[PDB]
Design a binder for this molecule. Sequence first.
Ligand SMILES: Nc1ncnc2c1ncn2[C@@H]1O[C@H](COP(=O)(O)OP(=O)(O)O)[C@@H](O)[C@H]1O
Ligand SMILES: Nc1ncnc2c1ncn2[C@@H]1O[C@H](COP(=O)(O)OP(=O)(O)O)[C@@H](O)[C@H]1O
Ligand SMILES: Nc1ncnc2c1ncn2[C@@H]1O[C@H](COP(=O)(O)OP(=O)(O)O)[C@@H](O)[C@H]1O
Lengths: 429, 430, 430
Amino acid sequence: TDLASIAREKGIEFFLISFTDLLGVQRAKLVPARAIADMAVNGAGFAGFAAWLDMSPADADILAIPDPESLIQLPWKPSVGWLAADVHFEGRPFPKAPRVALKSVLARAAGKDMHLKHGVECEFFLIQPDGSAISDPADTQAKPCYDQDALMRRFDVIAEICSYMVDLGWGPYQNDHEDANGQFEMNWDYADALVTADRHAFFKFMVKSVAERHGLRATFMPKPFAHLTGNGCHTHLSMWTAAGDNLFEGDGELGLSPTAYAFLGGLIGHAKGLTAVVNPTVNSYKRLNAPVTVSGATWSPNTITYGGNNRTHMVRIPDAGRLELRLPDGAANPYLMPAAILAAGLDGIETQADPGQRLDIDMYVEGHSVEAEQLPLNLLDAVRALEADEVLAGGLGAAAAAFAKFKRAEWADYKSQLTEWERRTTLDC
Amino acid sequence: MTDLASIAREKGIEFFLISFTDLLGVQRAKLVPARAIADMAVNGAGFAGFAAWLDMSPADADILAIPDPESLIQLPWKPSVGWLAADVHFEGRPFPKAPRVALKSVLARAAGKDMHLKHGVECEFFLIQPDGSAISDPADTQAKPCYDQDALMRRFDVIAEICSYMVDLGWGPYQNDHEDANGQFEMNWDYADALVTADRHAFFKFMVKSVAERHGLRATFMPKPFAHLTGNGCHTHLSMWTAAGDNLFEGDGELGLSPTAYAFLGGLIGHAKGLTAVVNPTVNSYKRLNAPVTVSGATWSPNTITYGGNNRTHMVRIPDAGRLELRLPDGAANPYLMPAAILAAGLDGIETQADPGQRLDIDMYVEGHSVEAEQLPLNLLDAVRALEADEVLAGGLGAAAAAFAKFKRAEWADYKSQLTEWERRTTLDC
Amino acid sequence: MTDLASIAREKGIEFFLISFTDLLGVQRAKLVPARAIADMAVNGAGFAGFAAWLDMSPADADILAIPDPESLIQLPWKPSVGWLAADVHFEGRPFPKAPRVALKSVLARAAGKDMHLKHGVECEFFLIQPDGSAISDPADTQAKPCYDQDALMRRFDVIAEICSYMVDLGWGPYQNDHEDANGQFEMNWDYADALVTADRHAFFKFMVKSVAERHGLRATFMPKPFAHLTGNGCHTHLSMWTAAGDNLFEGDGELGLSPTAYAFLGGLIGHAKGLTAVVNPTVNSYKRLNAPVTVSGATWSPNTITYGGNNRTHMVRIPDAGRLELRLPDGAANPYLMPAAILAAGLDGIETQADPGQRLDIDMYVEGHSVEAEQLPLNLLDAVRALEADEVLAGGLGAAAAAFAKFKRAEWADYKSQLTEWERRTTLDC
Ligand SMILES: Nc1ncnc2c1ncn2[C@@H]1O[C@H](COP(=O)(O)OP(=O)(O)O)[C@@H](O)[C@H]1O
Ligand SMILES: Nc1ncnc2c1ncn2[C@@H]1O[C@H](COP(=O)(O)OP(=O)(O)O)[C@@H](O)[C@H]1O
Ligand SMILES: Nc1ncnc2c1ncn2[C@@H]1O[C@H](COP(=O)(O)OP(=O)(O)O)[C@@H](O)[C@H]1O
């Protein structure tokens, strides 16, 4: 059926034709039902220059072509229908647009009968509308993870959103209060990478929208509070044949196949550059200065290492037939992130990359001793690692170079800023 | 035969709170939609143990909290949610550091000797301002406020609502009182098998806190929340039953007690110091009014390792034939570790035919200065040392004891850096 | 022949400040009454080194700070007090981690080759509100404020007072300027033997801070105290003299320089990265305005490892025949470690006949994007790594280098936990 006919059936009065730009910003146009047919076929016009797409004011408008299978009637306002879209420029999918970049990598893998499936653990904070503190002043204890009281104190927003995911058929299965005061997580079933990526982009918008409707605010910022741990976006990954078999399932260590370990080998070999994409902000690189590893230290790995059922590494092996990449944070682009991961993975497969030795230790503690390689310490270094990484850069195409340019400009901006701390500690130098 | 998915459908349960109690008594829970409960009930809900008070490592596999379907409680103030108590499992086995698991281990040993602990709890709590700075009722001020009719009825709405919930839940509530301190209250219900009472105890605190907050108030089970007032006890009533339904404490001796009851009592006396660490488990548990002429609420807490008689002045009171009341525990006492440690002490007393000593039919707050009675530990650190040195208790509670002690010493080091306003005001001019 | 007790009597000195500079540039001092100075001058003033920035242990014997009687300065704003610079001694020997001692070691090596470093410092500073939140003069606002006559005279009282002090002290002050940033100032004086200039540098900062505060203001030598303004340089002028009084940098080559000057310059270029760590020693030292069209005060700091010519756009300027100006250092540069590290780099250049490369007679803020010039370290951690990897510098400064690096990494770990308002505002909606 066409979108126009569905608009009539479901009572949809407007569609949000939406695309994700290089910085993860949701760009959208609100079009009345009477216009969906024309837009569905010809796309909605946007001036790509006004988004983060590294285009020119003199370029022809991009046409964003809605994927009708992505359709989501806003559960809090069903008369509006959300669509994810592919940005086209001059008659071709635009390779700097993240969803397009992802579909390209997916296409290469599918051509080898390898279909990436993933699921995302999107931690977020519920905070005051002005952003200055968490939403619950009573959520204060040192180890608040899974706090029953605080969890239920936010039952209304959490349960409302969860029920929405049930109805949407995402298979939500748990809601938690996470490690930091004010921090939460709502998990749902993994799916085909494109499906999960669309849900991911929609989910952030749904959480922000519902929080705001309850007089609160949600943030997926990696390190919103100086005194608390950060928002991870830990990602679970597996590769499937079209016929429905999990290629990662095998008879090797921990129930993993050689394909799984070669994929993991790409993740390891490509970790430095991968960091730039999945920890994509200046803020992504801040850490509590704590010798005694906080309860939430696990939100982020420090070392290019794996694995085991061990939340202390860059890659965890939770179970047979999957890998968990713990590297990504809450700012990770829903499309660029799976795309860059897949590019690194496929390469590991094609080069039969060796992931090295599994470390069955606590990398936060007994891993000071080990000569494990360290992850990039800031945005600029991660970006340089990305540019120097030919497989990764070539994997993502022109998205990589445009991304790197935006991040360098953010870096320059950042370097003009003063922290209160440096003023306090240097004024009397 | 208890199928959670089917009950969710019958009763309109949209979410379950799969919950467990950690070593510090904190309620840890995950909110799972009904569509996920079958899987969770069989396999458990995963939690990173490191993130709770379980003395685990960041690198450990997640624990799996396996819900006890029999504990199910639809939240009376929000029936679409079903609360479940759970046993922490680690590496395919029950996790001995988890309080509910520690308790079940002791009960199993007792049950193997055909001895079944039943207890009831007197969970005093205060109703206070949301910011915690004062009691909830500024008109509750009189020097002797206990059982004040006015103040009690002024909080009729919160108390009656919670009591009605307990009626419907089948706990057999039978009385609600204003207790000894201004702002202090208590709601009693029927004793039951220890695990049943423990689960109810854990749920009860959550219910009182939740309902208070819905009414714009706050509840606290803190031992000594106000410097000018007496404290929250968790006085505990105890009896031991055969599988066939006989109360072993019932007998022909003094006050209607059997020698078994007296030997159990003997274990409580013998293990008192270490017991204090578990049932008075916070730095705050050791604060006391400095009054030369006693006080109305002095009874909230015993000072001496003594019993008994129908006398609220001792560590152990004999309220009636067939039971002992341990008056030691305070409101911070872990709902599971407390019955566990008490049972460990009492089983040892029975096994050794422990002698409880002389019953003192005197007022221990007065006449108990004279009597050469042994004093209870005066602070957290001394209690913790007595616990670590107590083989029966430490061994009885398993690894839970050592982890508990490590946590308490860390709290103690924290406490030792703090300054009271008093010491500043009285020492600044030294 | 310089007797402190006798001078105290002649000149009315009631107290001495026996002072030393630690690795972070902090002035450590003890206030001793005149009656004690003889003993202190011979034996030194005791300090617990652990309590200053000297990377020592609580268990170490106190260091003894032995005052250099020749450094004596009666505080011009309070002549009853006599300031003395001191060498830190530990276990009967000069302490190599102490900056003044580190500097004297390098000078001794240079002097052993009949090479005597003389330098002068351009110590920019801002005059600011006592609370540090803004510059001291709310009327100093114009986009190009450099040498503003109005704003300069509006602070005539503090500037003239300090200048007069420098006149009486014999430093040969010759000019006072409003510098490039609003609120920024500079007071120049004659170059001198390196140790003399270093002592004066240390005293000067203290004098400016002290006099500003007496006038209800505050002075700061912080590199980048205001986000909207350029920074405080400590541009340093350098020449090397024989004992007989000849300036070795003077010669017949380009711009009146000898091959010795060019080889010295070659060492500055070769050792630039590591040098950056010492003379730009704070996290704050690496902040910069983000302007596409340069700025009036852009010159406060070089971006590239290049020279030279009478050109304020490079890391090294050749102001005139017979000297080099290193523009690298900022206001946080340790008065002793900075000349020490510079001299270590320059002596190596002379020893290796280091090639400085091509002089660039261009505007490096503009035309220096094109030129394939090497960039200076972009942050503290990278500078520190370059320093640790620099054998000549690390070896030249001795244990002072390693301790310095340890301190800077610790500051860095501290910095990495901080959030700017900018990143919160631009990332909260990610
Ligand atoms: N084979 C798989 N491939 C990709 N993602 C998966 C796979 N299996 C599960 N996931 C997803 O991983 C995420 C985390 O699952 P979860 O069972 O909570 O992991 P764990 O309990 O081990 O931490 C969920 O979104 C889940 O659906
Ligand atoms: N045989 C028993 N064993 C354990 N607890 C009991 C027993 N009998 C009563 N209790 C419980 O003791 C608690 C207090 O009972 P209560 O009659 O109010 O004591 P009293 O009036 O003597 O002070 C209640 O929870 C009650 O159910
Ligand atoms: N031969 C020299 N060696 C070291 N420093 C010198 C030498 N000559 C002058 N200086 C010092 O350099 C600093 C700057 O001098 P100045 O004449 O104002 O430089 P310019 O005007 O070229 O920018 C002063 O402290 C000055 O005394």
